[PDB]
Amino acid sequence: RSFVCEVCTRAFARQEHLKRHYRSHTNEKPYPCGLCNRAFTRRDLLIRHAQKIHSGNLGE
Ligand SMILES: [Zn+2]
Ligand SMILES: [Zn+2]
Numbered sequence: 001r002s003f004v005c006e007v008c009t010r011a012f013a014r015q016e017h018l019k020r021h022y023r024s025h026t027n028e029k030p031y032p033c034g035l036c037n038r039a040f041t042r043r044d045l046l047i048r049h050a051q052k053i054h055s056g057n058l059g060e
Pocket of ligand 2: 034
């Protein structure tokens, strides 16, 4: 069929192309804020981000 990335469901036509593109889909910021569309490296950071700007109440 086609080489589609298993992270953003994109499309390709080569294995080496999607290969190097997959390397940037695992060591990326695993804490994407779902309020401002940002990214963090630590989990404690994402909490201090919303609780200080968005909000808290268990969530965000
Ligand atoms: Zn991708
Ligand atoms: Zn945010």
